[PDB]
Amino acid sequence: KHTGYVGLKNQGATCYMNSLLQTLFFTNQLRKAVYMMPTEGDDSSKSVPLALQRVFYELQHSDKPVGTKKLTKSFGWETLDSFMQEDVQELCRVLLDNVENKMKGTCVEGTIPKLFRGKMVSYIQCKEVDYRSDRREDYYDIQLSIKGKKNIFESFVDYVAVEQLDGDNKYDAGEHGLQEAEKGVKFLTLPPVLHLQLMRFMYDPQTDQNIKINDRFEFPEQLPLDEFLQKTDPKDPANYILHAVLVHSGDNHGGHYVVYLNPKGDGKWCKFDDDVVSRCTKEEAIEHNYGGHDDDLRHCTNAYMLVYIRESKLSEVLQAVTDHDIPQQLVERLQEEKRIEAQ
């Protein structure tokens, strides 16, 4: 259309999956690596890599909304499964782990950690004895507290704030037994593609209720994170550019997902709502997804996952992808499938 991109068909309740697929498809560097996976020996409908290759190929070439039934088939799903509502970040964690494993031992091994993996450090200092310890761990996304925070910045401040370990949560200080302690986290590295999960939910133990948090929470088009690093790089500042806003409407138990993206990283935004792709404004993608109160005329619509890209990496991650990047063995297998289907 006036948009230049195609939507994905809903199978019944697959909006979460469609929203994720667009998000990953427009992670161009990831798309090209998926295209290179050695799937030639794979079974057409059992191979998750081949199904992703197919979805991406058709998103890149088709002029009508693209179907996903072969992808969900490759997941082992049947009709009922495509009617189950799901969490998009759960699917992200499961799908990327699966693709990363399938890339091991191949020419694109390590692509997914290269794009998404950072490292953080957790440090512990005992208060009554001289005993300290730290632990450095990888992450592929960040869980950000929302409740009582106005914006992403206050969430990161809280994320790195020092915390007391006392009471029923005393720290196991080895030969000193359980000890009152302080614990803090800092970031060592932030990845080229930064996935942020907004913790828009709480559990009430008094009524056994999962509850969604729709409070207002602001996130910026441009996100400087250098102050949350253990050490900054003057030649590579941790400045991040907003790429995607994965939006949930409804509650814990059901609702609807769309994704807003500016695929080129240039501030030209589109809304991807299953099969409908439509131009939109910056403010529709961003400020309108801050959450807050609804009117009396749907409801409870706000950002759940955010994707930022490191400014310094934007031209490598959003690098253009052409037909010279797709092995001809792959396009041939896809034509063959199309011709066998029309049988």
Binding site: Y16, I124, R135, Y171, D172
Partner: protein
């Protein structure tokens, strides 16, 4: 061994576990302490969502490792 879990409020709690504990066992201990039914829990560690039927040692989780507890926002 004592691990950490970042709860839904972003607070850190401690958990006493063994490398041979299954993920189901760990969710039961989180229920004990935090009150969240296991079927609602999802645990994130080093980019993986921990799978029922696996053990902590399957993920190389050790003393002072931090798991991240999240819920679901289901959508269609």
């Amino acid at each position: 061994m004592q691990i950490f879990v970042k709860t839904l409020t972003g607070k850190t709690i401690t958990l006493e576990v063994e490398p041979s504990d299954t993920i189901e066992n760990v969710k039961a201990k989180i229920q004990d302490k935090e009150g969240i039914p296991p079927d609602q829990q999802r645990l994130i560690f080093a980019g993986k969502q921990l799978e029922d039927g696996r053990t902590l040692s399957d993920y190389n989780i050790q003393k002072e490792s931090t798991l991240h507890l999240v819920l679901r926002l289901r959508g269609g």
